[PDB]
């Protein structure tokens, strides 16, 4: 109502806009690495996939950090539509609210940087040790794919002494291949999300910039009405 209130509101909004601009920029910088990673990993994946092409549980991957738009929403929804091991806290919570008894294993802290075969292999090892995953009649990997520079789509991918070592290795291969594509997708959706956020902040600033000027004119007029009536 008063000037000290509109100005503080405007300052808070400008702070939100700056905080979102820096986030957009850092998400733009962190992308090149993720895209290099996605391309290299998919180039590896093509080789191992070619064999199945010629011949013949769920892991759900998201990061723990939010403010990435619909990355976790669409994937939790796709997993429920298909209906579990959760990589990341946010898919963990989405699944835990709906079906708390189904979660068997959770991994967190991975997404802070581009994935690597160390994390994937160690996850595969704890998986085959605690769950003995290789015994399950079926295994499926749920992850997000960056179909474009401004959108993504969720996706499910199967996992079907050469056979033992081959499956045990392709498990780590596909977990890495999914983690990479999910990391790229979340960075892109954290660059478009903060773009929309900053533009909405701009629209809010353009509204409060009218509210402020109105309050300014009103304050001056009324202070001067008081002074004049005192001086009459």
């Amino acid at each position: 109502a008063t000037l000290k209130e509109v100005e503080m509101r405007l300052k808070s909004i400008k702070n939100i806009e700056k905080i979102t601009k820096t986030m957009k920029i850092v998400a733009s910088t962190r992308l090149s690495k993720a895209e290099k990673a996605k391309i290299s990993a998919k180039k590896m994946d093509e080789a191992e996939q070619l064999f199945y092409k010629n011949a013949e549980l769920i892991v759900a991957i998201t990061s723990d950090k939010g403010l990435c738009g619909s990355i976790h929403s669409q994937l939790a929804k796709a997993v429920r539509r298909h209906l579990i091991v959760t990589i990341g806290d946010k898919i963990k919570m989405q699944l835990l609210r709906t079906h708390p008894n189904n979660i068997k294993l959770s991994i967190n802290g991975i997404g802070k940087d581009a994935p690597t075969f160390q994390e994937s292999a160690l996850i595969a090892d704890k998986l085959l040790s605690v769950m003995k995953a290789g015994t399950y009649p079926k295994i499926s990997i749920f992850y997000n794919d960056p179909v474009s520079s401004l959108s993504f789509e969720p996706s499910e991918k199967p996992i079907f002494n050469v056979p033992r070592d081959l499956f045990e290795y392709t498990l780590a291969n596909q977990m890495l291949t999914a983690m990479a594509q999910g990391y790229a997708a979340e960075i892109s959706a954290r660059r478009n999300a903060m773009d929309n956020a900053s533009k909405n902040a701009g629209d809010m600033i353009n509204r409060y910039s009218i509210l402020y000027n109105r309050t300014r004119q009103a304050v001056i007029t009324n202070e001067l009405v008081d002074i004049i009536t005192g001086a009459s």
Binding site: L67, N196, M204, T229, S232
Partner: protein, 237 residues
């Protein structure tokens, strides 16, 4: 009205539209009467010139007067001396606001700024009181999250809060109601909704029975049965 109250002893209802004009007419004349003007430009006698009229509009041991007063708010400024002084003289106050009208939600009552002395469990019942408290809580939770929704979006919100926002958008829209005198310029025929039906409906909405019906089913309908009827009609489209 006072003769009907006292001399005839009958029950009386007094409609005054608009009582702000009394204070405004006093303001217009105050400057020519030779008085130093008070605040934003009203007369000194506002609070007492108002009281001398307002305190006559009251129920007495001799008779009852039920008073409905329209109070204009200039420049939408509820803080203007006249409304600010009138608020103290009324047992019930419904504040119509412009925002709720731009949203299309007639009769445009601000569900929160509107207040009544009788909204206590000793009078309306505990069910009714708790329903009204849950409605207010849902709507205020919705209004506290508006900045987040504007900038960030609804994705960030928690699971309870997404539900509370969907339910707030349903509730605020269900408080809309078409009036039989407004049909000429709104087209929608009128609806009268009983108190018990209203409480039961908002209870059923708060208790989650109708999370499966879209927001549009609640707009400008009457009771919950009409929400279901319109949901079926929209589905058939």
């Amino acid at each position: 009205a006072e003769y009907f109250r006292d001399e005839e002893g009958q029950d009386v209802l007094l409609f005054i539209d608009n009582i702000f004009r009394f204070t405004q007419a006093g303001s217009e004349v105050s400057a020519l009467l030779g008085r130093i003007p008070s605040a934003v430009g009203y007369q000194p006698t506002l609070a007492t010139d108002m009281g001398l009229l307002q305190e006559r509009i009251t129920t007495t041991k001799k008779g009852s007067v039920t008073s409905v007063q329209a109070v204009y708010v200039p420049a939408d400024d509820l803080t203007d001396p006249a409304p600010a002084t009138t608020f103290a003289h009324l047992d019930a106050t419904t504040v119509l606001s412009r925002g709720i009208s731009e949203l299309g939600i007639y009769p445009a009552v601000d569900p929160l700024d509107s207040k009544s002395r009788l909204l206590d469990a000793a009078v309306v019942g505990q069910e009714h009181y708790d329903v009204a408290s849950k409605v207010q809580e849902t709507l205020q939770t919705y209004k506290s999250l508006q900045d987040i929704i504007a900038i960030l979006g609804m994705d960030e919100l928690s699971e309870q809060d997404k539900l509370t926002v969907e339910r707030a958008r349903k509730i605020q829209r269900f408080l809309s109601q078409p009036f039989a005198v407004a049909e000429v310029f709104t087209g929608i025929p009128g609806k009268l909704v009983r108190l018990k039906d209203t409480v039961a409906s908002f209870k059923a909405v708060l208790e989650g029975k109708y999370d499966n019906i879209p927001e549009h089913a609640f707009y400008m309908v009457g009771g919950i049965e009409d929400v279901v009827a319109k949901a079926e009609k929209l589905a058939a489209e």
